[PDB]
Ligand binder design. Sequence first.
Ligand SMILES: O=c1[nH]c(=O)c2nn[nH]c2[nH]1
Ligand SMILES: O=c1[nH]c(=O)c2nn[nH]c2[nH]1
Ligand SMILES: O=c1[nH]c(=O)c2nn[nH]c2[nH]1
Ligand SMILES: O=c1[nH]c(=O)c2nn[nH]c2[nH]1
Lengths: 295, 295, 295, 295
Amino acid sequence: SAVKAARYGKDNVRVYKVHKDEKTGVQTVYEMTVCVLLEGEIETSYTKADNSVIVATDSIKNTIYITAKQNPVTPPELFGSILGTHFIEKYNHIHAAHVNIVCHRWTRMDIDGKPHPHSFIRDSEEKRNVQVDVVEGKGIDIKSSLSGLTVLKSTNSQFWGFLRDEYTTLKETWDRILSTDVDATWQWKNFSGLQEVRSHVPKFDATWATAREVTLKTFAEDNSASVQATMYKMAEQILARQQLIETVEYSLPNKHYFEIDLSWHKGLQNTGKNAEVFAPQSDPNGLIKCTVGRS
Amino acid sequence: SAVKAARYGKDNVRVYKVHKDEKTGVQTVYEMTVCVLLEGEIETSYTKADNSVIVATDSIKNTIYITAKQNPVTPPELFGSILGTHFIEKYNHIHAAHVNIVCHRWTRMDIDGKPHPHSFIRDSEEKRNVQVDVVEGKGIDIKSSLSGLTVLKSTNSQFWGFLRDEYTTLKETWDRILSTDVDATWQWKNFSGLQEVRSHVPKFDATWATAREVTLKTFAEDNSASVQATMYKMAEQILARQQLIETVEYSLPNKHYFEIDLSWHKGLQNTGKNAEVFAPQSDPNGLIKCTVGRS
Amino acid sequence: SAVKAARYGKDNVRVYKVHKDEKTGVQTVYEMTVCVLLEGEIETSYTKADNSVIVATDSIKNTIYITAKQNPVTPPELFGSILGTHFIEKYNHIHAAHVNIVCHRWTRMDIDGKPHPHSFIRDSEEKRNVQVDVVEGKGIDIKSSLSGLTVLKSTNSQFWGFLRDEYTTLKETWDRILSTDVDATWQWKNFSGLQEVRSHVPKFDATWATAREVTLKTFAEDNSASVQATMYKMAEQILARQQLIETVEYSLPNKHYFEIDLSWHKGLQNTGKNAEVFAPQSDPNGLIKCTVGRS
Amino acid sequence: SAVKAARYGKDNVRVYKVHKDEKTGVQTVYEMTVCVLLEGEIETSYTKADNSVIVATDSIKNTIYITAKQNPVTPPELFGSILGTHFIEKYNHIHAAHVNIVCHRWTRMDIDGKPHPHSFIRDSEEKRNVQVDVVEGKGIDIKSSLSGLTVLKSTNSQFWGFLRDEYTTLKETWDRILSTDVDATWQWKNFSGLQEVRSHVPKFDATWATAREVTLKTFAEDNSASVQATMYKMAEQILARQQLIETVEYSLPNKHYFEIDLSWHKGLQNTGKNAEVFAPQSDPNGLIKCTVGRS
Ligand SMILES: O=c1[nH]c(=O)c2nn[nH]c2[nH]1
Ligand SMILES: O=c1[nH]c(=O)c2nn[nH]c2[nH]1
Ligand SMILES: O=c1[nH]c(=O)c2nn[nH]c2[nH]1
Ligand SMILES: O=c1[nH]c(=O)c2nn[nH]c2[nH]1
């Protein structure tokens, strides 16, 4: 037998960093969870028990803390690029590094209408993520994403005109609830290395903001024909507004809310136009995915 | 053997309700998870296999939906009181009802600086809860709470002067990070029944708001001597501002963030006044509880 | 305002211990999660910021490891008694200790029909737990439990003859699936202190085994009239077989499996006697509780 | 913009099936969670709001239940093949179906040394999974796996001789604890269609059993030089024992158990050869992956 592929590293590395503006006394905090996996000429650790080629995963953990101490940790696209470049430049036999970063929200508190200098709240479980693949001789590939963004609209969603056959029991509707957890990923054009990533630093936060704003406004304003059609509208605008993006991917569950017929009880009317009380369903759920690119 | 205590019912009942203002076109949504347990003269279902005394748990589920269709579901203290009173008034052999309600956040979206008429976001995993115990001949006991409120301050927290003996390794500090998940419960004076609960309806949302505001402002502004001392300050103000509350209970984990000594690596300075990168600890955690009442 | 109650300590302390039989080379492992909360004359830490009365929670953590190094950690009723007695004997102003222990399964592997000397498998998520309250001048109160034991029987469960009124839609049945997660707690007679707990050490594992065996055999062999009736049978036998137990408490969800009517599709028969494919329901669920004692 | 890829369907479909041997009265149960995603000529649902090409996800759910009613559901490789073939044969514009199945354990209870006819226990959270991709004109690709298998050995694991540089603090060791959660996947040679899958039905359960046995025996008996080296030994044997497998993939966390130095307390000895009490670490964790194929 032979080794066809192999990677190894450290997962679930939690990191916090604080920035303190000595002048204003204002502090800013960052918290993330980091995963780093390495690839290279490491097959003999598997086949011959030769540990000499292994950078210990404990050392990878150390490296993450040291890099965060000596560099900016925002935007995460920059920090991930710096960290993966380190490993392939530092170790001759390591030729690829895969860095995943999850950013956790710590939003500044407003007290008495004024923003507080050093207190924060986790105002949501929504994440900002990056996946950075650094490959020797092939540059830096970055996928940026937002995940965990949970929304609901109580009207202005429709679903009619779908295929009907002998497996079909679902009724057409012109007014329904639509709720989803948004997972959206934008993939950047390949970058030749760290200098190029640094030259675009301003676009990373602005594009994350645009992606969020467009997702929110399109969900609220689209009189939706389907999940499929609404998500395509989001992806299109984002591509239109940032030319360095090559593809946009959306993955959207359809979290169903079912009507409850109460007519068995004293003729109570709770369906169609009289629907007021609904049963959220934990499972199963629709799952709809799309990758949109340039034509 | 004998039955010394017994209760039974339905848990994890998910409910959504929408309100539609025909005039303005503005819609408002409510989502909760409900648990209802009953007590009464039901021992023979356990000892004699006599199911005649059992209100089926499926029927309890139905009752929750019907009650939500016919009554307001906010504030949750009112809805829980109405639902538990129904069971003890409707069934002669049922003498107590225990109703737990978890309210989930659906916050109105602002689009282009304007509040949207029918789109919402789960802006946090924080919950608003109630526990309502309705007991025949003994009125209605309500405990209201907020839970899941996650906060952090990066400075203005201290912990020195604690007991030191041969089990002690912790060092005193005058500047540390404090992070917690707030669980706060305020217990109302007993109410004689539904009419009295209805007469106080306005105080329920205002007190929840006060409890939140006081928790947030005290956490941000207190130069904290300990978790114990800061939480006592919160409980005291709340009691001072709502006379119908009898006790306030706080339960606060201390989620530790540890310094990381990097001096082994090129003399890097990352402790004490140079501390910038920290390691969040998943476990173990301090747990500190207090119940405060009137003197 | 005044402090009416207060406790504080360390939660989520993970502990592993290994025992090595030098003679046979056989090793045995134990893993648990420990919570210790203290009560006493500690109110001024809350009201006056006096940390002098506080045993730091970090010190409590240390104490747990040291105690495990110097004493047996099985049965958990003994280890919890030893640990809580330490705190009230060691600190004059601490008058109660609350110790919760969760035991995780590490079951010896059988390889080639022979039990392996040092390899283990987590053969289930079922836990063995203890709650030990040690109170100065009032002895040691122990509640032992098993939790997470998940079972299902595909026939020989019934539910008919329950109350029917205008809230009722559930149909009577003489053959249904019954599935639950067992939570069972047996409460021991108060013990005067450590010497008495030690004199009964053999009964702790034997009673846990009995409780398990009786739970399993009664569930499998009872032609169940209801959850209520079957759980009473379990509690009764346990009380009959261990006289040092004062009460037995069971808490049992009814995890529903619903029939699926497929007759809309080519007259397919899948209900009643032809029921073969069912839909497990994640929520809601029945919840049935009973505490049984001696008459 | 253009659609570059798209798939949609139903996730988290829970299914139970019972088999009843009329002759012996013995019953056997199966429970699984199913995900089915479809691909095809469906782009206009995204770009033109044309729902005519959509098979509703509710209909997919129905199809899963009907297929389970009319066919065997074991082994899961067969059931997944049957279900994905249905969709591409039934709908002309659907050209690929992706079926994921998770099998949950329901193990027959032994009562009084005898196997019970209709009672079961979830004896572990370990899963048996399949991923089946059915593609029009390209046959059936099956990946089978076991996941959630949690093990620990308390000795006969080593880790020395790894790379040491200025990022390294980890010490070499010749005796450590090794614990992991096993994720193992074996990929079958492509099959031309259902008849070929049916001709190999006996190999599916036997290979799952072999994969399990080899994983367990190698973990227990290997005096491990590293996670990398031990997992390669497992993959090699499996390939040696089933020629229809093309690749074997392992993904193994290294769940660390750290020594605790207690010497600060009365010279207590708890490290190296005196190590008895350890601290399980929840995070971070090593992550080691390997794909092994034929040479
Ligand atoms: O938006 C929707 N898309 C779908 O594909 C679907 N199928 N069922 N309901 C649905 N709603
Ligand atoms: O606020 C705190 N309270 C405590 O009781 C404690 N113990 N350790 N650290 C602590 N911090
Ligand atoms: O065993 C049962 N007990 C109950 O109380 C019940 N209510 N609905 N179904 C039930 N089954
Ligand atoms: O088995 C191991 N493999 C590794 O790659 C490693 N790195 N640190 N510890 C380790 N143990």
